[PDB]
Amino acid sequence: SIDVKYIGVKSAYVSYDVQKRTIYLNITNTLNITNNNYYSVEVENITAQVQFSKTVIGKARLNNITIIGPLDMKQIDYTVPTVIAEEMSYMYDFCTLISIKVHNIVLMMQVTVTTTYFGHSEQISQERYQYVDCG
Amino acid sequence: SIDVKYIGVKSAYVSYDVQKRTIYLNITNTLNITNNNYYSVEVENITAQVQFSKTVIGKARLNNITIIGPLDMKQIDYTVPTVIAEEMSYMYDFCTLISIKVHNIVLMMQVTVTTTYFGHSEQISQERYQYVDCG
Amino acid sequence: SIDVKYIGVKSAYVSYDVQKRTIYLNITNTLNITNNNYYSVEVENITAQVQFSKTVIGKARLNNITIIGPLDMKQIDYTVPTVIAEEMSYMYDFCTLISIKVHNIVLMMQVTVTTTYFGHSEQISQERYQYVDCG
């Protein structure tokens, strides 16, 4: 990456800002900007690049061979009983939540078993979070 | 990436902003902008690139051979009983939720078993989140 | 990375800011800007690059062979019973939550079993968090 920017309200190269109840009188503004940007990113010179994978089996006796990749989820139990009993009562539930297995951004990058990788990998995940706003 | 920008309200190269109840009188503004942008991104010179995968089996005795890839989900149980009983009562539920297995953005990038990859991979996931807004 | 920026409110190269109840009279502003940016990022010169993986099996007797990758989740139990009983009462729940297994940003980068990797890997995850805002 080069320029990652997070701004809460206002981003401005040149900002002449005037707010309320302002007497803006007799202003003379002169501005010169000479901006140059030069970027040389991911410039690659490879004369040769080799990837080789070889598997040879000969006169072999293989048994019970078991290979399991990543992310092996087994025997998972989620239990949320919710019993509510009334007896001449007064319930005011304005903002209540029951949440299980909640995802916003889930990025997987090259989840495999056997990998031969050459190159560039970039991940950007920038945000703002407001899970609860209950007046 | 080069320029990732998050702005809450306002993004402006040049912003002459005037707010309410403002007496804007006798203003002389002069502005010169000379902006140049030069980008050389993902420029690649490869004279040669080789990917080779070879599998050879000869006079072999294979048994019980089991291969399982990634993301192996088995015996998964989700249970949310919800029992509500009234007895001369007053319930005011303005904003209530029961959520299970909720996703907003789910990106998978090259989830395999055997991979031979050459090149560039980029992932961008930028957002704003407001799960709950209950007046 | 080169420039990671987090700004709460305002980001400005040049900011002439005026607030409320201001008498802005007799201002003469002169500004010259000569900005040059030169970036040479990820410039690579590789004359040769070799990746080699070889597996040879001969006259071998293999048994009970078990290979398990990373992230092996087994026998997982989550239990949240919730029993509420009323007896001539007054409940005022304005903002209450029950949360299990909650994720906002989950990034996986090259989770495998056997990996041969050449290159660059970049991860950026910048945000603002507001889980609870209960008036």
Ligand SMILES: *[C@@H]1O[C@H](CO)[C@@H](O)[C@H](O)[C@H]1NC(C)=O
């Ligand atoms: C504002 O500028 C003008 C000329 O541009 C000048 O004659 C005047 O005296 C200045 N002030 C006011 C209050 O007008």
Ligand SMILES: *[C@@H]1O[C@H](CO)[C@@H](O)[C@H](O)[C@H]1NC(C)=O
């Ligand atoms: C920028 O503009 C001003 C006039 O506002 C001038 O005097 C100056 O020479 C300029 N600079 C360039 C580099 O052009």
Ligand SMILES: *[C@@H]1O[C@H](CO)[C@@H](O)[C@H](O)[C@H]1NC(C)=O
């Ligand atoms: C890549 O291209 C040629 C080939 O090697 C090389 O002479 C040149 O200097 C390189 N360019 C950059 C911008 O690195």
Ligand SMILES: *[C@@H]1O[C@H](CO)[C@@H](O)[C@H](O)[C@H]1NC(C)=O
């Ligand atoms: C492994 O192989 C033997 C026979 O050689 C077999 O009895 C056994 O059940 C195998 N293992 C599994 C886990 O099945």
Ligand SMILES: *[C@@H]1O[C@H](CO)[C@@H](O)[C@H](O)[C@H]1NC(C)=O
């Ligand atoms: C505003 O500028 C004019 C000429 O552009 C000038 O005659 C005047 O005095 C200035 N001020 C007011 C209050 O008009």
Ligand SMILES: *[C@@H]1O[C@H](CO)[C@@H](O)[C@H](O)[C@H]1NC(C)=O
């Ligand atoms: C920009 O414009 C101003 C006039 O507002 C001038 O004086 C200056 O020479 C200009 N600069 C360029 C580089 O053209």
Ligand SMILES: *[C@@H]1O[C@H](CO)[C@@H](O)[C@H](O)[C@H]1NC(C)=O
């Ligand atoms: C890529 O193209 C040629 C071939 O190698 C090389 O001479 C040149 O310098 C390279 N260009 C850049 C922008 O890197």
Ligand SMILES: *[C@@H]1O[C@H](CO)[C@@H](O)[C@H](O)[C@H]1NC(C)=O
């Ligand atoms: C493995 O092979 C044997 C016979 O060689 C067989 O009895 C057994 O059931 C196999 N394993 C599984 C898990 O089926």
Ligand SMILES: *[C@@H]1O[C@H](CO)[C@@H](O)[C@H](O)[C@H]1NC(C)=O
């Ligand atoms: C403001 O500037 C003008 C000329 O630009 C000048 O005549 C005046 O006396 C200054 N002050 C006021 C209060 O106008």
Ligand SMILES: *[C@@H]1O[C@H](CO)[C@@H](O)[C@H](O)[C@H]1NC(C)=O
């Ligand atoms: C910038 O502008 C001013 C006029 O405001 C001028 O005197 C100066 O020479 C300029 N500088 C350059 C480098 O252009």
Ligand SMILES: *[C@@H]1O[C@H](CO)[C@@H](O)[C@H](O)[C@H]1NC(C)=O
């Ligand atoms: C990369 O390109 C050529 C090839 O080796 C080399 O002569 C040059 O100096 C390099 N360029 C940079 C910007 O490092």
Ligand SMILES: *[C@@H]1O[C@H](CO)[C@@H](O)[C@H](O)[C@H]1NC(C)=O
């Ligand atoms: C390992 O192999 C033997 C036979 O050689 C078999 O009895 C046993 O069950 C195997 N192990 C497992 C965990 O299955």
